[PDB]
Design a protein around this ligand. Structure first.
Ligand SMILES: [Mg+2]
Ligand SMILES: [Mg+2]
Ligand SMILES: [Mg+2]
Ligand SMILES: [Mg+2]
Ligand SMILES: [Mg+2]
Ligand SMILES: [Mg+2]
Ligand SMILES: [Mg+2]
Ligand SMILES: [Mg+2]
Ligand SMILES: [Mg+2]
Ligand SMILES: [Mg+2]
Ligand SMILES: [Mg+2]
Ligand SMILES: [Mg+2]
Ligand SMILES: [Mg+2]
Ligand SMILES: [Mg+2]
Ligand SMILES: [Mg+2]
Ligand SMILES: [Mg+2]
Ligand SMILES: [Mg+2]
Ligand SMILES: [Mg+2]
Ligand SMILES: [Mg+2]
Ligand SMILES: [Mg+2]
Ligand SMILES: [Mg+2]
Ligand SMILES: [Mg+2]
Ligand SMILES: [Mg+2]
Ligand SMILES: [Mg+2]
Ligand SMILES: [Mg+2]
Ligand SMILES: [Mg+2]
Ligand SMILES: [Mg+2]
Ligand SMILES: [Mg+2]
Ligand SMILES: [Mg+2]
Ligand SMILES: [Mg+2]
Ligand SMILES: [Mg+2]
Ligand SMILES: [Mg+2]
Ligand SMILES: [Mg+2]
Ligand SMILES: [Mg+2]
Ligand SMILES: [Mg+2]
Ligand SMILES: [Mg+2]
Ligand SMILES: [Mg+2]
Ligand SMILES: [Mg+2]
Ligand SMILES: [Mg+2]
Ligand SMILES: [Mg+2]
Ligand SMILES: [Mg+2]
Ligand SMILES: [Mg+2]
Ligand SMILES: [Mg+2]
Ligand SMILES: [Mg+2]
Ligand SMILES: [Mg+2]
Ligand SMILES: [Mg+2]
Ligand SMILES: [Mg+2]
Ligand SMILES: [Mg+2]
Ligand SMILES: [Mg+2]
Ligand SMILES: [Mg+2]
Ligand SMILES: [Mg+2]
Ligand SMILES: [Mg+2]
Ligand SMILES: [Mg+2]
Ligand SMILES: [Mg+2]
Ligand SMILES: [Mg+2]
Lengths: 200, 82, 91
RNA sequence: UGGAGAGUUUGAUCCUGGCUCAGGACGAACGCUGGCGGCGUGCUUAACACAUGCAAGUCGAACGGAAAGGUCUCUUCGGAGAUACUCGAGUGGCGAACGGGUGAGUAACACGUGGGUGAUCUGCCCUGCACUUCGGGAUAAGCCUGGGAAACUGGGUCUAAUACCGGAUAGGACCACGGGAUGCAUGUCUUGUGGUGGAAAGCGCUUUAGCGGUGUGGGAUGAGCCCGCGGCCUAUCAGCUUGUUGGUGGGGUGACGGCCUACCAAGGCGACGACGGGUAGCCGGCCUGAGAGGGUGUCCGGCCACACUGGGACUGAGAUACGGCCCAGACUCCUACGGGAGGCAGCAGUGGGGAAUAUUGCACAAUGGGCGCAAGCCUGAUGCAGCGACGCCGCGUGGGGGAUGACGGCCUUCGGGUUGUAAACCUCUUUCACCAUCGACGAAGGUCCGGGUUCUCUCGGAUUGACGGUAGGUGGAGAAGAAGCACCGGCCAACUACGUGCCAGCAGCCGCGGUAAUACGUAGGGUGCGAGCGUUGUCCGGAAUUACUGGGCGUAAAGAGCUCGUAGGUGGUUUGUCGCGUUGUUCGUGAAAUCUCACGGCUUAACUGUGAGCGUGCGGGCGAUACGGGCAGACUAGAGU
């Protein structure tokens, strides 16, 4: 399933904005509800809970799938938080967002869902597809010249391109030099609280 | 079902095997009587005839070769001890 | 007797096969005496490797291959090597 | 490479110590809700009783034959002709002991692991060496009859065989005497002489169609039997045993053996739990856990046991002989009352029990299996499909802008706040569903035709897929067809209003409700999760509350009233040796799957393949001798005189 709900409420509860763009701010404080102005007790469970919430709603992942991503990360050699970030970052729709082909995360997800991309000449339409090192991502050649994809053809200058993927000329294609390192790539969160949440 | 054919052939085989084994048993008891008498004269060829019959039964497949050999050894030693 | 057969150990629609030396009085996916190869009927023609000396050992000692296994042995040339025929490789 | 705590005994405190909760899991059930796909999974209770259909046949290249089809065939003009492909019934071979089901029994060499078999067997298959030689009498079937209600059965004639029987020759049969090797006591293996013995089967041929048969040496395979070690509760079960323990001679077996028998001796097992009672199929594994442990044995795989209940044998290479035979018993049915028939713990299905578990489906296309020279024929194995959110995984119910703070709801200190960029509206894309269309891989295969003579090889041709006109691809219009469930006092994220007023009710704990309830019911709001969400049941965790890792006994539960002493456990200093413990290394084994790490393939994932780990162990060889232990000594410090 998908959330498909007001994103501003979900940012206002977690006290952090996760969207940016044209609807970057709601131009008002953060009382997320009717009692949203209350100065409430701050438990230790709450910090871990809301950090994992930020991690999930940054990417639109569902709890059952994030849980599996957690076992993958903790079971991977190395560390845990950076591996969790790397796994959550290698998602193909996230790659589409970070390669400057998307206004937001939701619409990048919809473009991946509607099958507007081919990786090794393979038509993929699963958002949770995981990209890999030396993967090329190609837009479906019969899908270009369409308005929401060509509106991102000329607006490829403002949001920076990270240093693990790469975009090329008018044929908008993506090359992955190596797997990312999200800890040095745009963390609006601390990965050390997800680990503590998944220990109780 | 058509195992009735097997049912009939099993009965025929049972009759043949029964007849053969009974004949060997009579031969063996006759030799035992001869050895108990101990004349050593007629037993000397009753042993040959009985061993021949045991071998023939083993070749016919009514008994097993090892059983035939066991009985032949026992009877030959019984003769030698008399 | 002793057979060289194909045991289906893939999934519901991808019939992977192992080339196993098994006694005939054994279920298809039973305990094999010795696995000596594999056969995948889904690749470019297909995927086929046989040990080619354990295969020779079993053929020499008396195992009778089933008919698809005979086809694979003819493809790989082990059957021709064993019987004494010219073409020892035909893939 | 992995370990979290919280509430509750008191006016308060610190300990001790129970109880309870937060996690995970399920072959699940129930409540509300419910879009799709992929891959799994589905009688846990009555091993209760079963209507119906199907689950084991095949060979005419073994045989006599001619019920059926096709024939050249005569001719009846509706009947003829085994000579003739072909073939119902029948004799004969092989198969039917596998495959499939269930877990009742079983505490046992049943299972797991490692050995032994000089104590054994093994159809078909591979392979070496020999041979395949003479005869003879019947009967099935047919035909004529008899008995019986049936189920079946008696007689007379009549005919074969690779059916049956008797001979000749043939060493791995036997007896006696010897040699040569080896050892682990019986012995084993190989040889020499003498004396006794033991088989066979033929059929076919478009002309190098081809199938066969018997004795033996050696392989492979499968199996039997014996042993070490390992895995439940119970002493409020303490005496069990007379073929019992052992021996000798016989018998029996494929094989050792009290396996059996006659005789002889008087032993055997037991506190390291005999005998008895309860429960239970065992394991690879599965769940949990930081680990050690605990629970469990369901899908899948291996082994065992059983087939209405109890007993027995026959045939055979091989029998718990599920769809074989005999007997007894219970049950259901037929009967002419004399007598007969049956066995879903095979697939599907019915009743019943139950909280609860599926279609009387398709195909032999693929793999495995049986018979056949082969084509072929059989296969409810198997390959798939149907049904059930029963489970795991994946994807949808849109996206980009937009304070009318729309409208309304609710709260308000009546000022405003909230739902809330959320809607309206503008615009964009159509994953899945819908419509139309093309259409698979699984098949380097199976068949007949051509080079190739055959064997082997392509060649090309038809033709062959249950799944399936499915997956998938392509195209069309449209935000278009698609969200719910639980909770919000603390644990534990999430708060107010109204109604109610120890009532109605809630509750895992302790508690909440007797007139201003964040704990009852509704509303608004919020939180978690999401095609699911809650409850119940069960297991582990938390629980260091059975403590090996890893706890205790002055007063919290806990030192026997005290001593002596049996088995047992433990043991001072020192020398030598052994190498049992211990430790090093190597070989074998520890099946596959599952698990971990890395890739590879399904659009991803679940799932699947490959490689390495793991498999803690056990057995064999070869090293070490510090410590433990054994064996042979020494010493006086402990102990005693
Ligand atoms: Mg027959
Ligand atoms: Mg008599
Ligand atoms: Mg004897
Ligand atoms: Mg008190
Ligand atoms: Mg006090
Ligand atoms: Mg406590
Ligand atoms: Mg049952
Ligand atoms: Mg016939
Ligand atoms: Mg035959
Ligand atoms: Mg048989
Ligand atoms: Mg059976
Ligand atoms: Mg059982
Ligand atoms: Mg054992
Ligand atoms: Mg007659
Ligand atoms: Mg002779
Ligand atoms: Mg003869
Ligand atoms: Mg006695
Ligand atoms: Mg005796
Ligand atoms: Mg039981
Ligand atoms: Mg623990
Ligand atoms: Mg029984
Ligand atoms: Mg029954
Ligand atoms: Mg019985
Ligand atoms: Mg046989
Ligand atoms: Mg027999
Ligand atoms: Mg029986
Ligand atoms: Mg039965
Ligand atoms: Mg049956
Ligand atoms: Mg049977
Ligand atoms: Mg059934
Ligand atoms: Mg009920
Ligand atoms: Mg009922
Ligand atoms: Mg088939
Ligand atoms: Mg077949
Ligand atoms: Mg339900
Ligand atoms: Mg809270
Ligand atoms: Mg009130
Ligand atoms: Mg309430
Ligand atoms: Mg899901
Ligand atoms: Mg507990
Ligand atoms: Mg514990
Ligand atoms: Mg302790
Ligand atoms: Mg204590
Ligand atoms: Mg003490
Ligand atoms: Mg006291
Ligand atoms: Mg006390
Ligand atoms: Mg005292
Ligand atoms: Mg003592
Ligand atoms: Mg002592
Ligand atoms: Mg001692
Ligand atoms: Mg000492
Ligand atoms: Mg393994
Ligand atoms: Mg891949
Ligand atoms: Mg060793
Ligand atoms: Mg002294």
């Amino acid at each position: 399933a998908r959330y498909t709900g007001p994103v501003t409420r979900k940012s206002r509860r977690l006290r952090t904005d996760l969207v940016g763009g044209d609807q970057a701010f709601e131009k008002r404080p953060y009382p997320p509800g009717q009692h949203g102005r209350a100065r409430i007790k701050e438990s230790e469970y709450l910090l871990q809970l809301q950090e994992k919430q930020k991690a999930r709603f940054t990417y639109g992942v569902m709890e059952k799938q994030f849980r599996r991503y957690y076992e993958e990360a903790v079971r991977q050699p190395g560390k845990t938080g950076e591996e969790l970030l790397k796994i959550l970052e290698s998602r193909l729709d996230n790659v589409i967002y970070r390669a400057g082909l998307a206004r937001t995360r939701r619409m990048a997800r919809q473009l991946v869902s509607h099958g507007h991309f081919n990786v090794n000449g393979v038509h993929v339409n699963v958002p949770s597809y995981r990209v890999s090192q030396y993967d090329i991502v190609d837009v479906r050649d019969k899908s270009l010249n369409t308005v929401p994809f060509q509106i991102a053809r000329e607006t490829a200058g403002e949001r920076p391109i990270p240093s693990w993927l790469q975009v090329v000329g008018e044929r908008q294609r993506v090359l992955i030099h190596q797997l990312p390192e999200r800890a040095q790539i745009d963390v609006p969160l601390t990965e050390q609280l997800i680990v503590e949440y998944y220990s109780k | 079902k058509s195992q009735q054919k097997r049912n009939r052939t099993n009965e025929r085989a049972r009759l043949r095997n029964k007849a053969v084994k009974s004949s060997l048993r009579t031969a063996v008891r006759a030799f035992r009587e001869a050895a108990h008498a101990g004349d050593k004269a007629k037993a000397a060829e009753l042993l040959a005839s009985t061993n021949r019959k045991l071998d023939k039964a083993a070749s016919k497949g009514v008994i097993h070769k090892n059983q035939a050999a066991n009985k032949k050894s026992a009877l030959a030693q019984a003769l030698n001890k008399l | 007797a002793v057979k060289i057969k194909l045991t289906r150990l893939g999934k519901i629609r991808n019939p992977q096969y192992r080339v196993a030396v098994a006694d005939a009085r054994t279920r298809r996916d039973g305990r094999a005496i010795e696995v000596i190869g594999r056969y995948h009927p889904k690749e470019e023609p297909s995927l086929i490797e046989i040990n080619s000396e354990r295969a020779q050992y079993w053929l020499s000692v008396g195992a009778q291959p089933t008919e698809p296994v005979l086809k694979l042995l003819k493809i790989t040339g082990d059957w021709q090597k064993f019987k004494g025929l010219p073409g020892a490789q035909g893939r």
